[PDB]
């Protein structure tokens, strides 16, 4: 009616106001300051391990806390806890829901969690006393598949689902304590700030919001992508994040100036992006593509500095150790390779 | 290295006890065929054989199958459908229902088309039934449901080149069962790339025996796989 007409026009006045402030702060791009930094040159790095033993494709992995162990979950319904230095399987946990889409590894080295199309999320008691790894809790309450998990500490998860909402449980009793709403599309990923008081999330409809753990809120809302968002992470300083959509571009947003700074485009790339992560010192940016490659972008004046090509199918996940000596990359042919 | 000798000798049993079980559970995984089940609308969820995935299991002449009925999800399939690019076949069920409550065929031709031309589902083969023939036979001779109103080329469509399977097959039904078939195969024979097939059928006119009709045509899908790797075919 008249009010829905005015409300659809009231918003436009607010939105048109917001752009003016953003375009009143830009006085030079990041690519004009860093035209004097000495270019890195070129770097080469070659595989140093190869872990075999899976039967199907791989959707997840998470480096341990001491950068020694790691976890990997596949679609044949089986979790495995490798050892990076000498290639020894230390555990092999069988599941009951064959469709597993994520996993996570506790910061205290004590817990492992995973969930998939079956809506429930399970948490596993690892360093038991009796000597048999079984299900500790079973967190139900979503409506739709579940596509990411993280821990804050022991007994507090923050999770993302497929019905356009996030949740924040507590393992001791099993029931939620908060619920975040405001995404009109499926939610695909999240990451936690390096002080554990915020977390940015990415969703289809091409938006990335900035929430607040203490009370559900939507401090910021960044936009500028051209298609849905697949993977996201923070700059190690906690003062920027980078994200990758399905249009073959990465971007480097900002949490203070509240806009976009610079973009990573190359003419010969027509494939999406499935994972993004930073380096330990924040000078490189390892990106994983669906051209089977894994480029390496200089992150203060965009231009490549190498390639990491060893796979035959797509790259479905990658990470970097906490201290930083290795880059494990999973793939849809069941092989993980510990680059260096 | 007086003690690390013991530990490295201690972990090498935890690597063999695991690897012995992980090999006994590689034969079982290779002896079962997985079968998805996409159903458009309300026709067919347990008719052939009688939250989350709702598995069901059966066996024909000592061969076992698994069937996934994806229920209690939202109707946005462009994210959880690319998880199923590994199954043997994709069973498929359509039915000519009423449009009073929009379009029960033209909303299925555009879904079957999307599974065919997907960049990741380029190596899986559909097995589609054409459900609810005892409903159509009581509507076509009654006139309530028509295909000329929705599909123009039906009135100027020819006669099939095959024969009736049953006594009591009027031109009205035969023109109906055999026009839709030629509307699905107009799609199935236009994809240049990929290596996959399509096996039509008819159902619901007779007592369902589809535990055989899926067994007889899930053998055809693997035979044509071994031939093409020896390059003999």
């Amino acid at each position: 009616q008249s009010e829905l007409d005015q409300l659809r026009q009231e918003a436009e006045q607010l939105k048109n106001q917001i752009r003016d402030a953003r375009k009143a702060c830009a006085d030079a791009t990041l690519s004009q300051i860093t035209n004097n930094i000495d270019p890195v040159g070129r770097i080469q790095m070659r595989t140093r391990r190869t872990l075999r033993g899976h039967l199907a494709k791989i959707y997840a992995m998470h480096w341990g806390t001491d950068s020694r162990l790691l976890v990997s979950a596949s679609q044949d319904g089986k979790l495995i806890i490798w050892d990076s230095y000498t290639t020894n399987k230390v555990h092999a946990i069988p599941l009951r829901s064959s469709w597993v889409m994520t996993c996570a590894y506790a910061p205290s080295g004590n817990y492992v969690a995973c969930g998939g199309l079956d809506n429930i999320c399970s948490i596993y008691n690892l360093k038991t006393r009796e000597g048999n790894v079984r299900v500790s809790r079973e967190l139900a309450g979503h409506t739709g598949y579940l596509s990411c998990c993280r821990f804050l500490d022991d007994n507090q998860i923050v999770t993302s689902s497929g019905d356009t909402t996030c949740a924040l449980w507590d393992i001791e009793t099993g029931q939620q304590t908060t619920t975040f709403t405001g995404h009109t599309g499926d939610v695909m990923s999240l990451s936690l700030a390096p002080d554990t008081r915020l977390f940015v999330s990415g969703a289809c409809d091409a938006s990335a919001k900035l929430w607040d753990v203490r009370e559900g809120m939507c401090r910021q809302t960044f936009t500028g992508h051209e298609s849905d968002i697949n993977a996201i992470c923070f700059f190690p300083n906690g003062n920027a994040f980078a994200t990758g959509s399905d249009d073959a571009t990465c971007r480097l947003f900002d949490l203070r100036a509240d806009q976009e700074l610079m973009t990573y485009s190359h003419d010969n790339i027509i494939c999406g992006i499935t994972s993004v992560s930073f380096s330990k010192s924040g000078r490189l940016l390892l990106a994983g593509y669906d051209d089977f490659n894994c480029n390496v972008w200089d992150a203060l004046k965009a231009d490549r500095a190498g390639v990491l090509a060893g796979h035959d199918n797509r790259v479905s996940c990658l990470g970097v150790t906490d201290d930083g000596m290795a880059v494990a990359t999973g793939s849809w042919d069941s092989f993980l390779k510990i680059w260096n | 290295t007086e003690d690390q000798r013991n530990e490295e000798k201690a972990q090498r049993e935890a690597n063999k006890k695991i690897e012995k079980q992980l090999q006994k559970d590689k034969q079982v995984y290779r002896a079962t065929h997985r079968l998805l089940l996409l159903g458009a609308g309300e026709s067919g969820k347990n008719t052939i054989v009688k939250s989350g995935i709702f598995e069901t299991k059966f066996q024909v002449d000592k061969v076992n199958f698994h069937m996934f009925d994806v229920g209690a999800q939202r109707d946005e399939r462009r994210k959880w459908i690319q998880c199923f690019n590994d199954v043997t076949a994709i069973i498929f069920v359509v039915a000519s229902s009423s449009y009073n409550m929009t379009n029960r065929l033209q909303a299925a031709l555009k879904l079957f088309d999307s599974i065919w031309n997907n960049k990741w589902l380029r190596d899986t083969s559909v097995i589609l039934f054409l459900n609810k023939q005892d409903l159509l036979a009581e509507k076509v001779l009654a006139g309530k449901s028509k295909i000329e109103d929705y599909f123009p080329e039906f009135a100027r469509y020819t006669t099939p080149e095959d024969a009736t399977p049953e006594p009591g097959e009027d031109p009205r039904v035969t023109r109906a069962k055999y026009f839709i078939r030629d509307e699905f195969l107009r799609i199935s024979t236009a994809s240049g790339d990929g290596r996959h097939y399509c096996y039509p059928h008819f159902t619901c006119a007779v007592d369902t025996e589809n535990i055989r009709r899926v067994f007889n045509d899930c053998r055809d899908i693997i035979q044509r796989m071994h031939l093409r790797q020896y390059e003999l075919l």
Partner: nanobody
Amino acid sequence: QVQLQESGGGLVQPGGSLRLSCAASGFTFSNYKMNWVRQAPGKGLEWVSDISQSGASISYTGSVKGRFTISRDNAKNTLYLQMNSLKPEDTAVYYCARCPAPFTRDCFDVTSTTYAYRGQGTQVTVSS
């Protein structure tokens, strides 16, 4: 961000014509397919037409072939329709729905739930 807003609808007696339009802003318009979608009053959404990326692969619906027409212009970022003779049944709202991904052949945009990348639509009415 993406902005799709349609204009051109109105009111016409049976036997008349009507011309619609569409507008794109925030992406490269010459990379994706496009479509049109209609919603009967108190009914779910149905498919109407489409057009390919360059303008050489058109399709229609079994109830409309011969009466409508779809065409686009890359260098100005616009896309039109063309209705010629309207029955009393051609009364609904019409949206301008883009396809999810670039450099593809396939789309998944009919869903009654919330779906981004889709305009607000114009109203058309027909009666004596």
